[PDB]
Design an enzyme around this catalytic site. Structure first.
Site, PDB file in Angstrom:
ATOM      1  N   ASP A 100       0.874  -1.137  -0.238  1.00 16.49           N
ATOM      2  CA  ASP A 100      -0.202  -0.253   0.095  1.00 16.49           C
ATOM      3  C   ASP A 100       0.498   1.373  -0.004  1.00 16.49           C
ATOM      4  OD1 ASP A 100      -1.384   2.134   0.325  1.00 16.49           O
ATOM      5  OD2 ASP A 100      -2.842   0.916   2.118  1.00 16.49           O
TER       6      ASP A 100
HETATM    7  C1  LIG Z   1      -4.521   0.717   4.899  1.00 14.99           C
HETATM    8  S1  LIG Z   1      -5.410   0.997   5.993  1.00 14.99           S
HETATM    9  C2  LIG Z   1      -7.233   0.873   4.266  1.00 14.99           C
HETATM   10  C3  LIG Z   1      -8.070   1.867   4.655  1.00 14.99           C
HETATM   11  N1  LIG Z   1      -9.039   1.475   5.410  1.00 14.99           N
HETATM   12  C4  LIG Z   1      -8.950   1.080   6.508  1.00 14.99           C
HETATM   13  O1  LIG Z   1      -8.132   1.675   7.178  1.00 14.99           O
HETATM   14  C5  LIG Z   1     -10.095   0.643   7.825  1.00 14.99           C
HETATM   15  C6  LIG Z   1     -11.562   1.320   7.602  1.00 14.99           C
HETATM   16  C7  LIG Z   1     -12.592   1.133   6.908  1.00 14.99           C
HETATM   17  C8  LIG Z   1     -14.231   1.444   6.802  1.00 14.99           C
HETATM   18  C9  LIG Z   1     -13.684   2.783   8.219  1.00 14.99           C
HETATM   19  C10 LIG Z   1     -13.394   2.769   9.203  1.00 14.99           C
HETATM   20  C11 LIG Z   1     -11.543   1.942   9.026  1.00 14.99           C
HETATM   21  C12 LIG Z   1      -8.824   2.267   3.649  1.00 14.99           C
HETATM   22  O2  LIG Z   1      -9.666   1.145   3.213  1.00 14.99           O
HETATM   23  N2  LIG Z   1      -7.834   3.090   2.243  1.00 14.99           N
HETATM   24  C13 LIG Z   1      -8.542   3.534   0.973  1.00 14.99           C
HETATM   25  C14 LIG Z   1      -7.778   4.807   0.251  1.00 14.99           C
HETATM   26  C15 LIG Z   1      -9.438   5.845  -0.417  1.00 14.99           C
HETATM   27  C16 LIG Z   1      -8.994   5.987  -1.437  1.00 14.99           C
HETATM   28  C17 LIG Z   1     -10.010   7.263  -2.658  1.00 14.99           C
HETATM   29  C18 LIG Z   1     -11.527   7.026  -2.780  1.00 14.99           C
HETATM   30  C19 LIG Z   1     -11.463   7.118  -0.951  1.00 14.99           C
HETATM   31  C20 LIG Z   1     -10.710   6.395  -0.060  1.00 14.99           C
HETATM   32  C21 LIG Z   1      -8.771   2.289   0.175  1.00 14.99           C
HETATM   33  O3  LIG Z   1      -6.809   1.968  -0.222  1.00 14.99           O
HETATM   34  C22 LIG Z   1      -9.556   2.623  -1.311  1.00 14.99           C
HETATM   35  O4  LIG Z   1      -8.941   3.139  -2.473  1.00 14.99           O
HETATM   36  N3  LIG Z   1     -10.702   2.246  -1.111  1.00 14.99           N
HETATM   37  C23 LIG Z   1     -11.339   2.413  -2.154  1.00 14.99           C
HETATM   38  S2  LIG Z   1     -13.336   1.647  -1.832  1.00 14.99           S
HETATM   39  C24 LIG Z   1     -12.960   1.408  -0.402  1.00 14.99           C
HETATM   40  C25 LIG Z   1     -13.054   3.064   0.760  1.00 14.99           C
HETATM   41  C26 LIG Z   1     -13.982   0.512   0.477  1.00 14.99           C
HETATM   42  C27 LIG Z   1     -11.305   1.050  -0.019  1.00 14.99           C
HETATM   43  C28 LIG Z   1     -10.894  -0.301  -0.084  1.00 14.99           C
HETATM   44  O5  LIG Z   1     -11.113  -0.935  -1.493  1.00 14.99           O
HETATM   45  N4  LIG Z   1     -10.260  -1.218   1.127  1.00 14.99           N
HETATM   46  C29 LIG Z   1      -9.560  -2.363   0.559  1.00 14.99           C
HETATM   47  C30 LIG Z   1      -8.064  -2.113   1.114  1.00 14.99           C
HETATM   48  C31 LIG Z   1      -7.179  -1.365   2.042  1.00 14.99           C
HETATM   49  C32 LIG Z   1      -6.078  -1.342   2.133  1.00 14.99           C
HETATM   50  C33 LIG Z   1      -5.858  -2.738   3.156  1.00 14.99           C
HETATM   51  C34 LIG Z   1      -6.701  -3.616   3.221  1.00 14.99           C
HETATM   52  C35 LIG Z   1      -7.656  -3.490   2.354  1.00 14.99           C
HETATM   53  C36 LIG Z   1      -8.937  -4.305   1.467  1.00 14.99           C
HETATM   54  C37 LIG Z   1     -10.334  -3.128   1.745  1.00 14.99           C
HETATM   55  O6  LIG Z   1     -11.316  -2.353   2.687  1.00 14.99           O
END
Ligand SMILES: CSC[C@H](NC(=O)Cc1ccccc1)C(=O)N[C@@H](Cc1ccccc1)[C@H](O)C(=O)N1CSC(C)(C)[C@H]1C(=O)N[C@H]1c2ccccc2C[C@H]1O
Ligand SMILES: CSC[C@H](NC(=O)Cc1ccccc1)C(=O)N[C@@H](Cc1ccccc1)[C@H](O)C(=O)N1CSC(C)(C)[C@H]1C(=O)N[C@H]1c2ccccc2C[C@H]1O
Ligand SMILES: CSC[C@H](NC(=O)Cc1ccccc1)C(=O)N[C@@H](Cc1ccccc1)[C@H](O)C(=O)N1CSC(C)(C)[C@H]1C(=O)N[C@H]1c2ccccc2C[C@H]1O
Ligand code: NA
Lengths: 327, 323, 327, 327
Positions: free
Chosen positions: C213
């Protein structure tokens, strides 16, 4: 007369150093051998040409000498060595204890290497059961006589030849290393030997018998292990120009790894390669040699010790490893 | 703290010595190199991490510095060095003349080996045709400038250590050898290279090009010659490791039209342990450099005192002696 | 008026650079994000204060804009982003292809960070199955459209900030690294994620899910894993002044290892520590954060990418790793 | 080659700028350090690897240099810095004065952080009593030599970034702040340190020693105070997923208060929380570190200076605080 300028040797340190015999401080150059368990020295009586320009031990000039005289003869596929046992003061730096050593008296068959170097003898630092005459190792003996508190010693070889290199007895100097110091348990009270899974690219050998040997300047590996790597290197397109020669910059050369349950010890490619030329060298040779010493046995020499500060703990039956540091 | 003791290097002399630059004697550790034709030295101006631990040349500290600034760059399938030509007093021993050297300004591709050695640069002792810039070899320049009468030098390594090694400029010291000095004609002025017939057991290579190169600690043979020896061994695979003091091995013979030079197993075998070693390895390395080419490094020069004669276009060989 | 000296940033290269939208070259500062799968850019239509200081995409200026308008809304306890899908030329350096991106229309929360920083948006470099809209990854689309012939990219961060970082597309640039470049297979095509065994001193977790990441500046470990570590640190007496603070030179801190069947990737103590003070710091903190993201899941952010050059290969479904080098 | 885009650092401004030594204007990146009382510069003569990529002071290039050569050595549990005192022209902006500074000849125990940053040295802005060698502060020296009329400086860090930071010497620029400038008297002329009552949720420490330190990007709190706070926010059901981690929108977190007899300085969650990701982060950490430095001692670094323009006044032995404005 014509203009002559002195040539030098290169800065290259190993477990070579000075100790002393007798109460008149008779000096020698010893190879401090982690895979041997006696101290052997050129005797004043040695009838062998080998012995001529060496340092000698003269039991008549030391007022603390003790007669033992038990004869011993050792023979290799390669050479033969006979002598007698003596006791006297044995000293490294500040510490001194009476110790049972072998005076060399006939040395046949180690030429021209023996007479070519400025090493007189061996100061074994292995374990009791590997020695002739069944003697307690020197450093244990220091503890017995309360000259030191802990039966432990360490070898620091300077990882870039920027400084002196050292053997330390009685304790651990943090000045020598970075990161963690990690102990592995000995698989046997013979040598300083430890169980490790060895990996070299796709080739591996689980629970190998791995031996520290401060006398070799090579890394060692079983024949079959070495064959598997040659074949796997071929499979993985690692370019070689002959069996042992490669571009120093070769990006396909793998890391050599020795893994325990909780720690991995590694030599990167340029840490196991020797350059073909002594400056600006494009080509390199594997400093890894197939030899069959025992089922599944691998030897770690100087190349490993150049990178890893190492610790030898009689009390705990362990070997400590840490990343050697520039002083 | 605790009981220390110093550990030192095993005395092993090679063609590595001191030389000075500028009228304030900037000192450098040089590989006195029979297979390079320039002097190369780290610039105070070098921006590489390689250059950090080393001695530097600083033209601004030398009244005799003459500006040149002609750019050089050597690049290699993996390796880069680059710098500028400069002219200043270059001194070996009691000998001194203005000479054009290369101040290296970038050194890339030779780690960690470079920083782990205490060599700073190369003092070329090769021929003009391989000098970048077509500069007269240092020794020839001494002669042009009447520093010496003969453009000759020699290299003596102590054949049994226990003794010091020497580079001698301008004449021949008899003290260094025994028996006669044999001369061979160069096959071509490119380097110190001679036509010789090489033999190893049943295998031979007629009219081979053999190069003296004070900068390898190895003996080199073409891949095809080594494969031939392997094949001939087939009659009865390692053959790379053997017993030390194994006398039942062939002798390496380099035959000129009037002298045969040889390296016996005890010249070409290197022990695996550093004291009382039971096993030994072949210090003969197969590698293709050029057509039919063999290189002679250290293990040869430890047996043979060698003389390099520019005036006469010859190499002289004699058995190195103690003292 | 008085004597004023400017104050600056500390050199700290992350996966942050420029890319363009539309045939009229509108530029944005993007976080190149290996754990996200869409491109998100502020719209000229954005009504939020957060958008005021940012670069904006204005579709009415680009003759190559193709209207989509599918609405998206992502809403999480730290903020909510809404927008619309749009298609236009998307350009990284010389390379250019029509691509579908999300113009953000409303950004609520993420303050003060989003507006304090100078990133406009996110340029996802992950896999399709994580994308909203199930859009092929940009690098894939480049290959799909014959712009490059290998759907691969790499991220290089300067391992000591002595030069610029680089995102490279389309092939492998050896100037960035010292071999070996070792490839590991992906356990799933959701993120850049691999099975590795993680070891931290005596603690271990087999067959862990480890995820690259490029958007965190931190290493992540599950809660239990961290608790196991605390447990054994207390037992073995590794000096901590509080739960994250230690001396930078602490000799009892272990190496963190990530082991594949053929290769170990490591972080020594001072490669997972951050200094308390910004110069000559006696004290350090662990840059390892316990967080439960997913069963047995560990995230590799900036500290790791700072040591390891990383290759992200869509054709072969693998990630490559190699020791990054100074330029 | 292949398509490549450069990667840049983020904009994160700190107490870090340029000053010059000697008449030829040898430039250095200094950390303008409110808790150090000397100026420290790498010498051209430094023999550590640490010094290798840094800017150097070369006394023989500056016609104004005066020999001093007084040795200095600072050593500790894991750090040695040694060198010599030298006197030369020292220049910040258009201001210049002869001044005694330390040429570092050896820097050991601060890697890898020291070489990873582009800081060359420290420019102390503390008080005489903490100086090695008992030297008048630079800004006081400027006053003695009649180069400015008030011995005062301020540090402005741009509260919302984009905006350069500024160090200002000699008077107060109103342009940097909104609202009154409140002054607190120093509890001691050792550092820029102030008596304050610190409150954090239910936890308080009265008549705490609070120190301004422009060299940490952290806020510091004694370990017992921190412990009481975490146990306390437990009792009151704060959402914590681990020991420093919470959501970036956590509503329930207390304001940190520093109370003097007539003004309360506060840091809200907004100012003490650091995000886990560098764009659109759901999760955050407390940038508050428990660490026992001295009895009742708390340190304010960047997070505080980001909100408060701060003024350091030697004449009146006071520090001034004002809310920082956008430029
Ligand atoms: C290394 S920490 C990852 C972080 N999630 C968190 O901390 C956990 C969390 C989730 C929900 C509520 C509170 C806490 C996160 O999802 N960040 C996101 C950043 C983002 C970028 C653009 C627009 C908004 C946020 C992500 O990297 C992404 O693009 N997305 C696009 S959609 C999403 C919001 C569901 C997420 C995802 O696919 N996350 C995946 C991810 C990312 C890093 C590590 C594990 C996982 C599993 C999965 O959940
Ligand atoms: C036979 S080991 C010689 C080594 N050549 C190689 O490794 C060539 C090589 C590389 C990769 C695959 C196969 C072969 C080499 O070129 N070493 C060079 C070391 C050097 C010293 C100072 C500045 C830079 C490099 C050389 O001694 C020199 O000064 N030069 C100056 S120019 C050069 C870079 C072309 C090289 C040369 O003449 N090389 C030739 C040489 C030298 C000795 C023996 C054989 C040959 C043939 C050719 O390889
Ligand atoms: C926010 S912590 C302050 C830090 N002290 C520590 O880490 C405490 C420590 C020390 C040794 C082992 C474990 C813990 C420290 O002394 N940093 C120093 C950084 C430095 C800068 C230049 C050259 C070398 C180090 C200091 O700001 C300084 O210049 N000095 C110059 S001399 C000094 C080593 C006595 C120290 C000092 O004034 N320290 C004072 C200080 C500074 C900040 C906060 C509290 C105090 C009390 C006092 O100790
Ligand atoms: Na394993």
């Amino acid at each position: 007369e014509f203009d002559n300028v002195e040539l030098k040797d290169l800065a290259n340190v190993l477990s070579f150093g000075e100790a002393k015999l007798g109460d008149n401080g008779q000096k020698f150059n010893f190879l401090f051998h982690t895979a041997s368990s006696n101290v052997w020295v050129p005797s004043i009586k040695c009838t062998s040409e080998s012995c001529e320009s060496k340092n000698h031990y003269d039991s008549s000039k030391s007022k603390t000498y003790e007669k033992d005289d038990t004869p011993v003869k050792l023979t290799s596929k390669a050479g033969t060595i006979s002598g007698i046992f003596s006791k006297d003061l044995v000293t490294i730096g500040k510490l001194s204890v009476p110790y049972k050593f072998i005076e060399m008296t006939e040395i046949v068959g180690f030429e021209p290497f023996y007479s070519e170097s400025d090493v007189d003898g061996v100061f074994g630092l292995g374990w009791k059961d590997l020695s002739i005459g069944s003697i307690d190792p020197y450093i244990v003996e220091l503890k017995t006589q309360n000259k030191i508190e802990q039966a432990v010693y360490s070898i620091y070889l300077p990882p870039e030849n920027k400084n002196k290199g050292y053997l330390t007895i009685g304790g651990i100097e943090e000045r020598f290393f970075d990161g963690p110091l990690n102990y592995e348990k000995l698989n046997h009270d013979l040598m300083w030997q430890v169980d490790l899974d060895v990996h070299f690219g796709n080739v591996s050998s689980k629970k190998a018998n791995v031996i520290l040997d401060s006398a070799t300047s090579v890394i060692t590996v079983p024949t079959e292990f070495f064959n598997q790597f040659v074949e796997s290197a071929s499979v993985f397109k690692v370019p070689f120009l002959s069996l042992y020669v490669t571009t120093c910059g070769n990006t396909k050369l793998p890391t050599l790894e020795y893994r325990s349950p909780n720690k991995v010890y590694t030599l990167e490619p340029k840490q196991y390669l020797e350059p073909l030329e002594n400056i600006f060298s494009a080509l390199c040779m594997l400093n890894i040699v197939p030899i069959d010493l025992e089922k599944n046995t691998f030897v770690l020499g100087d190349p490993f010790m150049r990178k890893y500060f190492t610790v030898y703990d009689y009390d705990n039956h362990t070997v400590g490893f840490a990343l050697a540091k520039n002083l």
